[PDB]
Design an enzyme around this catalytic site. Structure first.
Site, PDB file in Angstrom:
ATOM      1  N   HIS A  41       0.793  -1.240   0.000  1.00  0.00           N
ATOM      2  CA  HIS A  41       0.000   0.000   0.000  1.00  0.00           C
ATOM      3  C   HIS A  41       0.832   1.300   0.000  1.00  0.00           C
ATOM      4  O   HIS A  41       0.333   2.355  -0.416  1.00  0.00           O
ATOM      5  CB  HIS A  41      -1.062  -0.002   1.115  1.00  0.00           C
ATOM      6  N   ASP A  88       0.037  -7.663   1.809  1.00  0.00           N
ATOM      7  CA  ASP A  88       0.498  -6.280   1.822  1.00  0.00           C
ATOM      8  C   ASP A  88       2.014  -6.255   1.910  1.00  0.00           C
ATOM      9  O   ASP A  88       2.603  -5.786   2.895  1.00  0.00           O
ATOM     10  CB  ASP A  88      -0.173  -5.489   2.962  1.00  0.00           C
ATOM     11  N   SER A 170       3.535   2.751   8.141  1.00  0.00           N
ATOM     12  CA  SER A 170       3.283   1.761   7.096  1.00  0.00           C
ATOM     13  C   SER A 170       4.599   1.252   6.500  1.00  0.00           C
ATOM     14  O   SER A 170       5.506   2.052   6.221  1.00  0.00           O
ATOM     15  CB  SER A 170       2.457   2.412   5.985  1.00  0.00           C
ATOM     16  N   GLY A 171       4.710  -0.065   6.325  1.00  0.00           N
ATOM     17  CA  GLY A 171       5.864  -0.680   5.682  1.00  0.00           C
ATOM     18  C   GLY A 171       6.988  -1.025   6.651  1.00  0.00           C
ATOM     19  O   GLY A 171       7.918  -1.768   6.308  1.00  0.00           O
TER      20      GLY A 171
END
Ligand SMILES: CCOC(=O)C1=C(C)N(c2cccc(C(F)(F)F)c2)c2[nH]cc[n+]2[C@@H]1c1ccc(C#N)cc1
Ligand SMILES: *[C@@H]1O[C@H](CO[C@@H]2O[C@@H](C)[C@@H](O)[C@@H](O)[C@@H]2O)[C@@H](O)[C@H](O)[C@H]1NC(C)=O
Ligand SMILES: *[C@@H]1O[C@H](CO[C@@H]2O[C@@H](C)[C@@H](O)[C@@H](O)[C@@H]2O)[C@@H](O)[C@H](O)[C@H]1NC(C)=O
Ligand SMILES: CC(=O)N[C@@H]1[C@@H](O)[C@H](O)[C@@H](CO)O[C@H]1O
Length: 215
Positions: A41, A88, A170-171
């Site tokens: 994402h 993801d 995120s990530g």
């Protein structure tokens, strides 16, 4: 990271900052000299030719000689499904190879299929929102849970207070027993709800795929 703490400088040398025109938008994990892995994402609707990959960072607001900067040569995905919030994960191949030193190191991953029991103590981390955005890398103690989770995610919760990952985390890796077991994927009830566990991509499920790409 909400309700976390500052990391000791370079305590986590696998920790990567993904940046556009000089600004952090996502975390990543250095998994080989010329590969990082992040959340799918992070890069969806982003032009990757614009992404700078920053290794060896600590204070993003400061000029840091410890840093190494790369472009993205190629991306590898594994069936990213944003409707179901599944798979993801993304691997970004770098335009060169990291110089492995004190401040820039490759992370250790679990074995394929390796599962974490309810109550494993992990560490979340990232340069995301503090509740402004972080200048210094933050870390946070979190606990693995299964209530309100699924088999296709690793979920974590901080008990007794409202703490958790947030926008910009995120990530980023989740480190459990010295291994990267998660990639920060999604929150429910907003950040640090105290109700819904944070959800991470289950890195152990993707280990065979990861190895086929990096070696
Ligand atoms: C298309 C871009 O969407 C986002 O950027 C989302 C973000 C940042 N967070 C988000 C927000 C705060 C913190 C984090 C985390 F956990 F990664 F640190 C993610 C989020 N939460 C819920 C839905 N989303 C979406 C999202 C959508 C699909 C998938 C998948 N697979 C994961 C997240
Ligand atoms: C790899 O790329 C490094 C930095 O690239 C920079 O960032 C990207 C996103 C673009 O903005 C690009 O124009 C910038 O130069 C270089 O410093 C490094 O030399 C490159 N490595 C190679 C090709 O050996
Ligand atoms: C808070 O976290 C500290 C560090 O966690 C440990 O090391 C990290 C890198 C991961 O490998 C993780 O699995 C380990 O637990 C702990 O030393 C400390 O005891 C934790 N405190 C509590 C009570 O959660
Ligand atoms: C990386 C880290 O700090 N790990 C610690 C370890 O050193 C310590 O023995 C224990 C304390 O309960 O918790 C864990």
């Amino acid at each position: 990271i909400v309700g976390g703490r500052r990391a000791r400088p370079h305590a986590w040398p696998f920790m990567v900052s993904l940046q556009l025109r000089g600004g952090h938008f996502c975390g990543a994990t250095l998994i080989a000299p010329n590969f990082v892995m992040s959340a799918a994402h992070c890069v969806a609707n982003v032009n990757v030719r614009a992404v700078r990959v920053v290794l060896g960072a600590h204070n993003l607001s400061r000029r840091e000689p410890t840093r190494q900067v790369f472009a993205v040569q190629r991306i590898f995905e594994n069936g990213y499904d944003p409707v179901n919030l599944l798979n993801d994960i993304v691997i970004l191949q770098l335009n060169g190879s990291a110089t492995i030193n004190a401040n820039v190191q490759v992370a250790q991953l679990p074995a394929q299929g390796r599962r974490l029991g309810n109550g494993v103590q992990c560490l979340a981390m990232g340069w995301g929102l503090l509740g402004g955005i972080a200048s210094v890398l933050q870390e946070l103690n979190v606990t693995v849970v299964t209530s309100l989770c699924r088999r296709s995610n690793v979920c974590t919760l901080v008990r007794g207070r409202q703490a958790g990952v947030c926008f910009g985390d995120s990530g980023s890796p989740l480190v459990c027993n010295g291994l990267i077991h998660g990639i920060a994927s999604f929150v429910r009830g907003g950040c640090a709800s105290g109700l819904y566990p944070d959800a991470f991509a289950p890195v152990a499920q993707f280990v065979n795929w990861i190895d086929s790409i990096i070696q």
